[PDB]
Amino acid sequence: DSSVIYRAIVTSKFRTEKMLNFYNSIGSGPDKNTIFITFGRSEPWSSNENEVGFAPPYPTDSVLGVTDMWTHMMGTVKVLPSMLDAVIPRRDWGDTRYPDPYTFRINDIVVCNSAPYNATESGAGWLVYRCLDVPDTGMCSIASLTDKDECLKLGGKWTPSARSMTPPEGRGDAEGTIEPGDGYVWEYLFEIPPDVSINRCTNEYIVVPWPEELKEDPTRWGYEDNLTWQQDDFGLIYRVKANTIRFKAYLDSVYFPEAALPGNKGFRQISIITNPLEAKAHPNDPNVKAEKDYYDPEDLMRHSGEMIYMENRPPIIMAMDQTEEINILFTF
Amino acid sequence: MNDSSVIYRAIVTSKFRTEKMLNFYNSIGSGPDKNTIFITFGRSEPWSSNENEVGFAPPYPTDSVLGVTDMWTHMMGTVKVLPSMLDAVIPRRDWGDTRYPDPYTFRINDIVVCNSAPYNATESGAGWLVYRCLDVPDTGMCSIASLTDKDECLKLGGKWTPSARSMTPPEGRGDAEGTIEPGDGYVWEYLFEIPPDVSINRCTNEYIVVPWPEELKEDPTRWGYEDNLTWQQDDFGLIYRVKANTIRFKAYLDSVYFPEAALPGNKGFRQISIITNPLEAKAHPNDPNVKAEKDYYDPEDLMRHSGEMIYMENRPPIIMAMDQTEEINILFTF
Amino acid sequence: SNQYRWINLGYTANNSFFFDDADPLTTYIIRVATAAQDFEQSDWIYTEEFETFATNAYTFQNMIEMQLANKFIQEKFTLNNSDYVNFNNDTIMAALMN
């Protein structure tokens, strides 16, 4: 083939913006989408449900698959923007329950300061660091090569063969070097207040703030001090390359009118629909867009709004305890 | 995880691919919150010894800042992409053209255009009417992809090549509610209107434009609604029903806006990016800062590395001689 | 892929269809796939290259008073030649054997 050829790749930063686009898209007024979570499907399918494996009916996106859904919907909850949050993969420094506790690739964000085996500063904060460099020893990445720098040119991912003693101790970029001792040049990036970490962060993911909550104070997030050639560089959601978002809601918040049915027989399939219209008595009424807080699905028009996601799952009967949690973590 | 006791099934459907796209365009607007877009132009360096030729290609860019930084070094000028220029598209299949491989056929769910041309022209006061798609293939004669055959195997299997031609594929605006079925089989489902003005402008040899909601909901009868009772079913808007799921924006690079650069010999070597929400020179560094609203900013005044780079590309020569405008088409599925 | 051809045996709405023919000491290599209305076909899966046996076998139950002619066994069952006597078709008969 002889022709002009161009080699192009979308940057990862495109994703985080797209993520930032789904957030802010939640609001009351028009042009702001409103998402609902739906459960429903009270009646059991087959008899092999409640057994092991066996799979559910695989859900389809056709019109027939939507119609029945609206007939079985037991209840719904409206997602408010507050209960949605950004998230990133968390690597706790020097934790033995996750791979490579003492070793780190060229750039990997790693939280420290939480749990005793990493100490660094006190006054909590759950400090986080990007790690800009590594000791040079040990064979790494493509083919053989030998040395770090040559392995850093020609692409490559260099894994240090020397355990990194002690966590990153400082508040500012490139905390390594400056002493005969080893370690490598971690770079502070923000902080996580203790109050949010007990709620908003699970052990799989650590929250990173929306470029909003960083306003109405930065300090709570330990971002109060920064180089910032720009007046702000305010949103750091780009700095981490945060690729994903996470939802959380308590099942006490979802609204079941019947209130004895979801408990006795589980909701077998969950789907999330967008922009439902309110109940219209007859096609004599103008189209209104759904607001307030609960919506017994009787008050939702059938096929009223489009549905981005369907799940089919075995019965997942729910206890009425005031804590059980939805997750539904989006990867945008 | 793997092979868990419980096994669940999740479609993610189509619409999420489209609805996510809508949120992208739904804020391009003017203000602090609306994060406008800017395309950008390229490198002056011969880029290699073998530069102009067919074989070989620019080196693959890198997402790392080490590659982000060289653009603002090697870049000249940024055209702006207005909200009006970006557009959502569809492959534009049309019946009757001999140039494209299969003249009619158009199996099961496919988008057609007619009345666009010599061969397909009918009933034209409306220009292109035709974004309507096929509801059902015609009766039998479908020999489909595997062994089995009959009007059955679409369900357990693939798609039908009906083997019979279609005739009179033009159609009225449509039947009340559900739509027309003029000939043998080949039921047709009428999909919007597409007036002629937007056609000759914002369509192309490939693809086609679909309106966004907030236009049609604003104005029926230009794009031609109120025939559709299924409209009041789910508000106006319909970018979903078309299953658009793709977005492209374009930019006009006119050598007049960049009179420097455009001299006898400019070689415009590769690099043509995209970006978001840049900022002004700021004069002396201490100051407030402003969102950048003015077209064709020069590379200087942009606060080197302001905003975040959302795209990258390398096209080895281009040309960019004076008086020859440049039209860049870039197509995303987001 | 230089061989095997393939032979479609049809489709089924439940797992585990029962197959016939397959002349002895030949065939082998079954393969299956799944499909639906809205989904693209999955990938084929092969089973452990089996092989058919020499003749056939049966163990049948009936009254202890009744006995079976060895031809009716050999023709219809252990050699699997149908149409010998098809109880769905033929008229049979009965005689009193003094």
Side-chain angles (χ1 to χ4, degrees), chain A residues 223 225-226 228-236:
Chain A
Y223 177 79
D225 304 346
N226 202 28
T228 61
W229 178 251
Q230 182 175 352
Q231 293 300 103
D232 289 347
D233 274 340
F234 175 80
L236 64 90

mmCIF file of all heavy atoms in Angstrom, chain A residues 223-236, unseen atoms left out:
data_model
loop_
_atom_site.group_PDB
_atom_site.id
_atom_site.type_symbol
_atom_site.label_atom_id
_atom_site.label_comp_id
_atom_site.label_asym_id
_atom_site.label_seq_id
_atom_site.Cartn_x
_atom_site.Cartn_y
_atom_site.Cartn_z
ATOM 1 N N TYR A 223 -4.931 20.583 49.252
ATOM 2 C CA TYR A 223 -4.486 21.225 48.031
ATOM 3 C C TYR A 223 -4.231 22.708 48.243
ATOM 4 O O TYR A 223 -3.850 23.408 47.301
ATOM 5 C CB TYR A 223 -5.530 20.985 46.940
ATOM 6 C CG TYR A 223 -5.270 21.627 45.613
ATOM 7 C CD1 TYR A 223 -4.373 21.080 44.713
ATOM 8 C CD2 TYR A 223 -5.953 22.771 45.248
ATOM 9 C CE1 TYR A 223 -4.151 21.671 43.492
ATOM 10 C CE2 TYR A 223 -5.741 23.373 44.038
ATOM 11 C CZ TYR A 223 -4.840 22.824 43.159
ATOM 12 O OH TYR A 223 -4.639 23.443 41.942
ATOM 13 N N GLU A 224 -4.389 23.190 49.478
ATOM 14 C CA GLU A 224 -4.310 24.620 49.760
ATOM 15 C C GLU A 224 -2.981 25.224 49.336
ATOM 16 O O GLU A 224 -2.881 26.444 49.187
ATOM 17 C CB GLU A 224 -4.540 24.870 51.248
ATOM 18 N N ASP A 225 -1.954 24.404 49.148
ATOM 19 C CA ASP A 225 -0.627 24.876 48.786
ATOM 20 C C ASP A 225 -0.206 24.192 47.499
ATOM 21 O O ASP A 225 -0.223 22.962 47.425
ATOM 22 C CB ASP A 225 0.379 24.552 49.882
ATOM 23 C CG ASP A 225 -0.026 25.111 51.220
ATOM 24 O OD1 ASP A 225 -0.933 25.964 51.261
ATOM 25 O OD2 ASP A 225 0.555 24.688 52.239
ATOM 26 N N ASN A 226 0.167 24.969 46.490
ATOM 27 C CA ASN A 226 0.583 24.321 45.259
ATOM 28 C C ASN A 226 1.422 25.279 44.425
ATOM 29 O O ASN A 226 1.379 26.492 44.626
ATOM 30 C CB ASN A 226 -0.639 23.832 44.484
ATOM 31 C CG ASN A 226 -0.301 22.736 43.521
ATOM 32 O OD1 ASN A 226 0.646 21.982 43.741
ATOM 33 N ND2 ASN A 226 -1.085 22.611 42.460
ATOM 34 N N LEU A 227 2.196 24.713 43.496
ATOM 35 C CA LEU A 227 3.040 25.522 42.619
ATOM 36 C C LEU A 227 2.181 26.454 41.775
ATOM 37 O O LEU A 227 2.280 27.680 41.877
ATOM 38 C CB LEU A 227 3.889 24.596 41.734
ATOM 39 N N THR A 228 1.296 25.878 40.961
ATOM 40 C CA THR A 228 0.282 26.616 40.215
ATOM 41 C C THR A 228 0.813 27.816 39.451
ATOM 42 O O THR A 228 0.579 28.953 39.859
ATOM 43 C CB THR A 228 -0.820 27.107 41.144
ATOM 44 O OG1 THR A 228 -0.258 27.985 42.123
ATOM 45 C CG2 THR A 228 -1.488 25.940 41.826
ATOM 46 N N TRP A 229 1.533 27.589 38.356
ATOM 47 C CA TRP A 229 1.853 28.707 37.479
ATOM 48 C C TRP A 229 0.592 29.422 37.021
ATOM 49 O O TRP A 229 0.590 30.644 36.843
ATOM 50 C CB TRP A 229 2.646 28.229 36.275
ATOM 51 C CG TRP A 229 2.946 29.341 35.362
ATOM 52 C CD1 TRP A 229 2.411 29.564 34.137
ATOM 53 C CD2 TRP A 229 3.827 30.425 35.621
ATOM 54 N NE1 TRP A 229 2.928 30.713 33.600
ATOM 55 C CE2 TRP A 229 3.802 31.260 34.499
ATOM 56 C CE3 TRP A 229 4.650 30.762 36.691
ATOM 57 C CZ2 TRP A 229 4.565 32.407 34.416
ATOM 58 C CZ3 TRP A 229 5.400 31.893 36.609
ATOM 59 C CH2 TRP A 229 5.357 32.706 35.483
ATOM 60 N N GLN A 230 -0.478 28.674 36.800
ATOM 61 C CA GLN A 230 -1.776 29.248 36.514
ATOM 62 C C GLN A 230 -2.427 29.719 37.803
ATOM 63 O O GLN A 230 -2.110 29.240 38.892
ATOM 64 C CB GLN A 230 -2.662 28.221 35.812
ATOM 65 C CG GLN A 230 -4.038 28.716 35.403
ATOM 66 C CD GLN A 230 -4.807 27.689 34.600
ATOM 67 O OE1 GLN A 230 -4.268 26.655 34.220
ATOM 68 N NE2 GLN A 230 -6.077 27.969 34.343
ATOM 69 N N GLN A 231 -3.341 30.678 37.671
ATOM 70 C CA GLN A 231 -4.031 31.211 38.839
ATOM 71 C C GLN A 231 -4.636 30.105 39.677
ATOM 72 O O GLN A 231 -4.733 30.225 40.902
ATOM 73 C CB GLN A 231 -5.118 32.189 38.413
ATOM 74 C CG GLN A 231 -4.556 33.424 37.805
ATOM 75 C CD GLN A 231 -3.659 34.135 38.778
ATOM 76 O OE1 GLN A 231 -2.437 34.061 38.680
ATOM 77 N NE2 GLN A 231 -4.260 34.811 39.745
ATOM 78 N N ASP A 232 -5.068 29.029 39.033
ATOM 79 C CA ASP A 232 -5.744 27.947 39.731
ATOM 80 C C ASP A 232 -5.152 26.579 39.410
ATOM 81 O O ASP A 232 -4.698 25.895 40.334
ATOM 82 C CB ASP A 232 -7.242 27.993 39.421
ATOM 83 C CG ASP A 232 -7.930 29.171 40.082
ATOM 84 O OD1 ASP A 232 -7.321 29.806 40.964
ATOM 85 O OD2 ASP A 232 -9.095 29.454 39.738
ATOM 86 N N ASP A 233 -5.160 26.141 38.143
ATOM 87 C CA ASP A 233 -5.040 24.712 37.829
ATOM 88 C C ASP A 233 -5.986 23.945 38.734
ATOM 89 O O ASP A 233 -5.692 22.853 39.218
ATOM 90 C CB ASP A 233 -3.601 24.194 37.946
ATOM 91 C CG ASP A 233 -2.797 24.389 36.669
ATOM 92 O OD1 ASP A 233 -3.418 24.568 35.604
ATOM 93 O OD2 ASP A 233 -1.548 24.350 36.720
ATOM 94 N N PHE A 234 -7.148 24.548 38.937
ATOM 95 C CA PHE A 234 -7.959 24.267 40.104
ATOM 96 C C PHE A 234 -8.398 22.815 40.143
ATOM 97 O O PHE A 234 -8.104 22.098 41.104
ATOM 98 C CB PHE A 234 -9.138 25.218 40.082
ATOM 99 C CG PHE A 234 -10.122 24.978 41.137
ATOM 100 C CD1 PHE A 234 -9.912 25.435 42.422
ATOM 101 C CD2 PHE A 234 -11.286 24.323 40.833
ATOM 102 C CE1 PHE A 234 -10.847 25.217 43.376
ATOM 103 C CE2 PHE A 234 -12.212 24.108 41.782
ATOM 104 C CZ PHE A 234 -11.985 24.549 43.050
ATOM 105 N N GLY A 235 -9.092 22.353 39.104
ATOM 106 C CA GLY A 235 -9.438 20.963 38.984
ATOM 107 C C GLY A 235 -8.186 20.143 38.762
ATOM 108 O O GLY A 235 -7.446 20.368 37.805
ATOM 109 N N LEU A 236 -7.944 19.204 39.665
ATOM 110 C CA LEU A 236 -6.872 18.236 39.511
ATOM 111 C C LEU A 236 -7.372 16.904 38.988
ATOM 112 O O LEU A 236 -6.572 15.987 38.794
ATOM 113 C CB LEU A 236 -6.143 18.058 40.841
ATOM 114 C CG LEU A 236 -6.905 17.481 42.026
ATOM 115 C CD1 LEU A 236 -6.758 15.997 42.030
ATOM 116 C CD2 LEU A 236 -6.402 18.066 43.309
#
